[PDB]
Amino acid sequence: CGAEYVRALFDFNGNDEEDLPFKKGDILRIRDKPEEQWWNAEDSEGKRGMIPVPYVEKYG
8 A cells, every 4th residue: 555554464463562453455554663572553543553563464
């Protein structure tokens, strides 16, 4: 896409440290990147959290 679009192939609704919940095949937009591992993305609910980049992928 381009509009900071990332898909979560993995699942982890959990929240070890206030992480961002998601499943396999979820859509999450890339907002900011406070960390090098976890980025602040927005799930399909305007929920901004630190989603794992290694758990999600980049869209076209």
